Design a protein around this nucleic acid. Structure first.
Lengths: 52, 57, 54, 131, 88, 156, 226
RNA sequence: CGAAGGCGACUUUCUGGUCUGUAACUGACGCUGAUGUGCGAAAGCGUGGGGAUCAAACAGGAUUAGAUACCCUGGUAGUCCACGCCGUAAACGAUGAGUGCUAAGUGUUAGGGGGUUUCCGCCCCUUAGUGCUGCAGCUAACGCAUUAAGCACUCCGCCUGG
């Protein structure tokens, strides 16, 4: 939702590519592509935390 | 970007002669220690001279 | 101390750049501060002092 | 709600013996004091100490060790226990470890060693084996 | 549970002498307040099962003190049944 | 001088892609009939050389067996894992009664009169080591009084 | 006189130990206190140990025995070679070869080689060889005196062993206790004193803590000779 | 956090338990617990509701060597609520409960202190939780190791070839 002006379009993309990667959009909808079981995400979050 | 690799070391008390010995046993140009008698943090280093220099922080 | 849910300015440095919550991993607060914070950030979402998303 | 006091005494002594400790303390009694008094007379511990506190005064034991870092008490077993009390007549009052170790026995004179119960010709509840 | 001004009130009647809270009949009376308070809660909330073993535990700690109180003086036990209504 | 005695030879093969293996191992008991006994194993292929491999391996570990004469000093049970032998002293005219592997570790020290029974497991590696570990933990009457601080007559 | 005096013993810096969080609980007897992460080796008690370390090592050389000196920690490698030559004993600079006290019926097979391979090129049988076989006969020659350089003239088992660290040289101490060879060594924090019979509590990651402590134990055998 | 099953927006009411500290008070009032009596995931069943997504059964299209599988479109019971049931799970830490005792190192939780402070930062010693390493000891071996599978004592459940 960030406005980028006074430049080209190939530099507003460089802002926007990291203003989406630092957001819960792409990692959120890839998670909800399919219903996971209510006790396998507690281990999926555990693997995504024990590795840090 | 530039990535500076950190080498962690734990500060320890010793003679300056000991710091020279340990620094040579690694070939490191810098060795930082706490001085045995002065109690202060000391950095023995090899100058561009090739001679040793001693910094107290 | 205790976070009051009206004190918006100290409470909105903890909200994200979209309206999410910063974890205490990236902010650096303690444990009991973070969950005393989160019951005040969510009473302030309910009375429109802070958004849900921007 | 520990249920056997002088077995809890007797495994404090075994666990201190295993880690080469030389000093431990007990929540004491009369029978705890006078079992610990009878090990120094037979010569397993060095010296037992005083009973001092307001409620259930503690006492310290001072285990004794060999000169080649060996231990004196090698094995220590409670035989009578709640649920199954064992009693012995003076005729079949048994020798521990072919007469080497002892068997402190509560008889009607106060507790006495293995040796001191046959020539006294009294039996009673046989408390433990010390070897 | 019950408030402290409700709790400090009920330890005045069954007190044996001043500053003797923790006496058996002064901590049975405060249980019978807590028994009657929670099963009135539990009467209108019949599905609350986690609060029920809180009730059923302090029923057990009241019974173990009534059984204790008979073993050393029976005439004090008869007075407490008449003072606050219990069966048995 | 040492007295060799075998317990058993074993015929062991490990599976190879080509031809399988021909390892014949053996454990022996080595003692002197005076209070000093050791055991050991030896792996080779030449069978009389497989014996002498185990004999010299027994030579590095000899345990001193204390003894009141013609018997063992007191009553013990040895333990090593699952093997467990029993060891009661006997009168000096009874004869040593023991099983297969535990007789060889009892004859090679001079006792010749004790009660025994190998409780527990059965494999000859373990019960010959659960007997040495039993005979490791024997105590004379004289050296206990050194530690305990009394004399030999004060213990009785 | 008898012991190291108190001034030059702590001037070498032997009162330093290793770090707290890096501690062995069996070394509680030989620690006076910890000062800023570091422990304080009881200095009065290690004097009561280094004299006992001086007493037997006096009379080991009185029998004419051979005491083995080993040192492999990188800040104490060549502080034990120069003290073994002054003592006339056998040193180890490089890593433990893995059996030079236990499988030394195959190590003395190669101490026989170093008594032979240097004889092999001082005489003839050297011109007829190919020039690259000259290299591997010399590439064998230095690698013998790398590891077995201090065991050059040693042909029998030792009767005592002197280690600078039981941690890094744990392969040697495990061979010592199987042969019933008595053992003396410099230990500190992160060292087990159980396998060492004759304990010297001193610092281990300083040169003067080694060199002003390993020299007197090297000196301890010289006046045991005469 | 709870005894387990389990519990995740927010607010109020009603209510249960644990922990810390102080020592005022009661003075063994304790522990375990057959029979008994109550809780007990999901899927089920009953009487009604409600029905958004999802989805057994079912229908159709592809794949394949072949299908009733996998994949795709659609879809009913169910999933959800209220009241009664059912009482079973790899209900698992495959480890009953209670109380003692026995190297240490290290994260973290509510604290308690603290020394400091910090612009609150922290870093320090402290019950009770919760993890990861690791001696002694134990184990058949993996491994366990003050949250024992170590050393003991009590009581209950249970096993004795497939």
């Amino acid at each position: 939702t960030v406005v980028r002006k006074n430049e080209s379009l190939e530099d507003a993309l460089r802002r926007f590519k990291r203003s989406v990667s630092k957001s819960g959009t792409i990692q959120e909808v890839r998670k909800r592509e399919f219903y996971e079981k209510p006790s396998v995400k507690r281990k999926k979050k555990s693997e995504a935390a024990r590795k840090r | 970007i530039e990535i500076i690799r950190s080498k962690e070391f734990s500060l320890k008390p010793m003679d300056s002669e000991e710091a020279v010995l340990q620094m040579n046993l690694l070939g490191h140009d810098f060795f930082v220690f706490t001085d045995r008698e002065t109690d202060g943090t000391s950095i023995v280093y090899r100058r561009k001279d090739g001679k040793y220099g001693l910094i107290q922080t | 101390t205790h976070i009051d849910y009206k004190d918006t300015e100290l409470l909105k440095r903890f909200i994200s750049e979209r309206g999410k919550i910063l974890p205490r991993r990236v902010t650096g607060t303690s444990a009991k501060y973070q969950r005393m914070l989160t019951t005040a950030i969510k009473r302030s979402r309910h009375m429109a002092l802070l958004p849900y998303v921007k | 709600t520990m249920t056997d006091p002088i077995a809890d005494m007797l495994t404090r002594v075994r666990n201190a013996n295993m880690v080469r400790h030389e000093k431990l303390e007990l929540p004491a009694s009369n029978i705890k004091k006078e079992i610990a008094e009878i090990l120094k007379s037979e010569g397993f511990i060095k010296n037992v100490e005083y009973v001092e506190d307001d409620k259930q005064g503690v006492l310290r034991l001072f285990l004794k060790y060999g000169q080649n870092d060996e231990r004196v008490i090698t094995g220590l077993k409670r035989i009578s226990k709640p649920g199954l009390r064992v009693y012995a007549k003076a005729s079949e009052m048994p020798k521990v470890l072919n007469g080497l170790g002892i068997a402190l026995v509560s008889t009607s004179e106060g507790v006495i060693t293995d040796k001191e119960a046959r020539k006294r010709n009294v039996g009673g509840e046989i408390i433990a084996y010390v070897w | 549970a019950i408030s402290q001004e409700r709790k400090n009130e009920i330890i005045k009647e069954y007190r044996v002498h001043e500053t003797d809270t923790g006496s058996p009949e002064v901590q049975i009376a405060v249980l019978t307040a807590e028994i009657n308070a929670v099963n009135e809660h539990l009467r209108t909330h019949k599905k609350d099962h986690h609060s029920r073993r809180g009730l059923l535990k302090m029923v057990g700690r009241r019974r173990h003190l009534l059984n204790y109180l008979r073993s050393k003086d029976i005439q004090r036990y008869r007075e407490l049944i008449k003072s606050l209504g219990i069966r048995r | 001088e040492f007295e060799e005695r075998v317990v058993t030879i074993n015929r062991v093969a490990k599976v190879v892609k080509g031809g399988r293996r021909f390892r014949f191992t053996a454990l022996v008991v080595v003692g002197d009939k005076n209070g000093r006994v050791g055991f050991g194993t030896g792996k080779a292929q030449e069978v009389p050389e497989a014996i002498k491999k185990a004999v010299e391996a027994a030579k590095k570990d000899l345990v001193v067996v204390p003894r009141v004469e013609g018997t063992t000093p007191h009553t013990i049970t040895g333990r090593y894992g699952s093997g467990s032998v029993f060891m009661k002293p006997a009168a000096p005219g009874t004869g040593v009664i023991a099983g297969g592997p535990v007789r060889a570790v009892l004859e090679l020290a001079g006792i010749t009169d004790i009660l025994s029974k190998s409780l527990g497991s059965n494999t000859p590696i373990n019960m010959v080591r659960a007997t040495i570990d039993g005979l490791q933990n024997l105590k004379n009457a004289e050296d206990v009084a050194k530690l305990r601080g009394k004399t030999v007559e004060e213990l009785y | 006189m008898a012991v190291i005096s108190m001034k030059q013993l702590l001037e070498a810096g032997v009162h330093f130990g290793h770090q707290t969080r890096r501690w062995n609980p069996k070394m509680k007897k030989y620690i006076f206190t910890e000062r800023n992460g570091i422990y304080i080796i009881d200095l009065q008690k290690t004097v009561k140990k280094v004299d006992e370390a001086y007493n037997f090592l006096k009379q080991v050389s009185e029998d004419g025995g051979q005491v083995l000196f080993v040192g492999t920690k990188k800040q104490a490698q060549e502080s034990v070679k120069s003290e073994a030559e002054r003592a006339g004993q056998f040193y180890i600079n490089q890593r433990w070869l893995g059996g030079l006290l236990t499988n030394y019926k195959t190590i003395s097979k190669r101490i026989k080689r170093i008594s032979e391979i240097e004889k092999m090129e001082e005489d003839g049988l050297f011109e007829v060889l190919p020039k690259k076989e000259v290299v591997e006969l010399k590439k064998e020659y230095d690698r013998l005196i790398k590891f077995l350089g201090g065991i050059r003239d040693m042909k029998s088992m030792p009767q005592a062993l002197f280690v600078v660290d039981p941690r890094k040289e744990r392969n040697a101490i495990a061979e010592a206790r199987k042969l019933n060879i008595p053992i003396v060594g410099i230990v500190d924090t992160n060292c087990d004193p159980d396998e060492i019979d004759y304990v010297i509590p001193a610092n281990d990651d300083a040169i003067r803590a080694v060199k002003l402590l390993t020299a007197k134990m090297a000196d301890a055998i010289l006046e045991g000779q005469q």
